[PDB]
């Protein structure tokens, strides 16, 4: 199987700046040639263009409504449509928000698929809940149909079909949930393994539960979104919302590395990665790195070790 | 229920200076006003106010034996006064010899406490198997039951009544005892996990032992005597007793927070916080913070998010 | 049982330099004389004196052939010799590659014995697959029956003799593995515990497998190949392979602790410590110290504590 590299350079879900120089930040650090390595076909689709939409006024709290709407627009199609082609679609952030698209687009030509969402926060937070107007906190409420309705229509997000289900995503790394995204989760009974939950069992266990859990009756496509901020900030510290204690390298690995052995990768989200933010060149190369890392592991490269079929090196 | 928190600017304990700023720092970092807003009532009772026995001559080995007599003599009192009004104590150091009166007082009002000890030492040497005087290292000693006569009378600590035996405490974290300490804990068979425990069974199983361990029968009041160099330095690195492989910040909180869902936490001890002691300001900071972390994690703040009852934040 | 401490100050395995440095740091940290307050009886055998063959022309890829060759001859010498008088082999490097002298010596008088590799790669690749013809990159293959004629011979390794089988030796820590070195290790169905291994199973649980893979049936001795490179290079800073997303400290002393307790420890190496590979001062000490941490390990020292038997410190 092949698959599709799509830079996604949008930062208006945060309010922070920086994020969209993050696909290059990536691409920069060698993502692609990497992932031309594997054995995996490779196509870098470029980085969609994004056309701010002028005098975006916050609709209510919600900051750059319209802007994040279209952008998410066209990506949910560049998506889609490479998903269409059966192509694995890996999309480079930018910020959390674009995951709406990521997965919008994904649904449509595989809408049984289920979401293994890794990120310290669950970004499960409504226009009416968020205490910032953010979209990039806001992405699993646009999508989730248990939360259609429960908020008004914001503008540019008209094209958002709640495409999945609290019974179609699971959490991991959570560590930082708002009053009402935890109501919000717990009130929806979603399945997550917090920061609790993997020091309670260990990554391993985390995993075997989180994959019988969501692939136990059907084996569907899996649309791994994977923020960035999810890692301890000691691996991942480049981003606009550090938590301490979170999955550490080796655990973050293990994910992606667990993911890729399941073969149902169907679409991946590196997002959060914001060069700008680094104490030290270090930091934001660290970062960047891992972020490589993650991608690859989700790919095939194993901890391990790695040699090509069919071939005696003696 | 409510939460008293009590001061204790002491440092005779530690050769060393600069934990009676310990209770200070807690502060400065937002711990009450943060406390506040937990599902507890909260009153700041202030610093008991030590007062220095002039001419405190070394009984032995044993230092400032009256100074810190008298001082935990205080606290015990402010400690069972505030304990018998039913509000849980919480004494943020200071160092770990002020351990002493915040048990004693405690138990008290709750005699038929246990105890959860925290940290990389046992500080259950005994004035004679000391290395140095400090009795910041011999807390456990003077509360022991078994330990009782088994070494001669420091002045100041006549009032002292070994109020808990070895099947009543139990150690988390471990990694450095002295050869008599450990001989003590083997010999009374004291029930612990050192490090090694809990790179064998995984922070989640050693929560369960220890609290089936100390509750299984009856479910007495609990006291949590945490030392902050339990964690390892590159957490709590401000501390006069750092130790390497320690409690990771996850292990430690998953430890408080558990023992916050038994419900019974009725004693809580802040200990070896010393500003001072920092490489950099980063240092500093950073331990204070997981020291106000620990705290409330205590007291119901949950990695995995938290919600106001009764409370439709839709 | 006693202890012999044997030097081996040699570097031509790796291309850099500075680990011959390295049984003097490890020395100076205090190796010695903390060793000998463990139940062990110990003796210093000193540093071999390595004769650099004149003209080393690299046999092809495999560069300094004879001179590591005439190295490891030397030792395995010395190892075979005080093994043969019942005494605990212990080795400080230099480099990886005079494992093949250590391991080849201690198989002559305990050939029965099995081996615990530690470290980040498998260093298994043969003069045909390395990519360098670095040999500090290719110890277990001239121990290894299996790969025996799978490749050319060496000038200077003539005289060692596969000594062991793929059933008598495992990994533990592995995250970097050459193309060849894992169609190798995956050829010879050789069981090892990558760090991905150990993030799922946990490094307790990796234990028991390891040990009742390579004693479950016979007792036999204990081969410990300990890489310092196997540890995260947080704790293990100074070596010239470091690879991120390695075993804690805790992890590594928790190995060491249960090999110790197996009573099998026969031989051991502490190799690639190289102090001149500091970032700063620290690092370089940091490195060493748990260098030594590990080898009181393997030795008694237990974080649990320690106490001299028959003794009442009351
Ligand atoms: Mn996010
Ligand atoms: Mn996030
Ligand atoms: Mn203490
Ligand atoms: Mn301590
Ligand atoms: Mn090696
Ligand atoms: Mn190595």
Known sequence: KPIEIIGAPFSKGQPRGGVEKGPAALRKAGLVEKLKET????????????????????????????????ANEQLAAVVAETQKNGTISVVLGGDHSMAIGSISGHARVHPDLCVIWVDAHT??????????????????????????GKFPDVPGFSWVTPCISAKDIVYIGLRDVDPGEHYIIK??????????????????????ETFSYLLGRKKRPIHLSFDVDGLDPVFTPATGTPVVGGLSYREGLYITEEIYKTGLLSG??????????????????RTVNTAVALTLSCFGTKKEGNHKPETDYL
Do not use: C, W
Not at 133 to 147: C, D, I, M, Y
Not at 187 to 208: A, N, P, Q, R, W
């Open 39 to 70: 054995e995996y076909n490779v196509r870098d689709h470029g980085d969609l263009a994004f056309v701010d939409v002028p005098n975006d006024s916050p609709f209510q709290i919600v900051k750059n409504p319209r802007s994040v709407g279209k």
């Open 123 to 148: 970004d499960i937070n409504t226009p009416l809940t968020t205490s910032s107007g953010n979209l990039h906190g806001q992405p699993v409420a646009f999508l989730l149909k248990e939360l259609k």
């Open 187 to 208: 009130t929806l009974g979603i399945k997550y393994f917090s920061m609790t939950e993997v020091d309670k069992l260990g990554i391993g266990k985390v995993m075997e």
């Open 268 to 285: 991946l989200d590196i997002m959060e990665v914001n060069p700008t933010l680094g104490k030290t060149p270090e930091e934001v190369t």
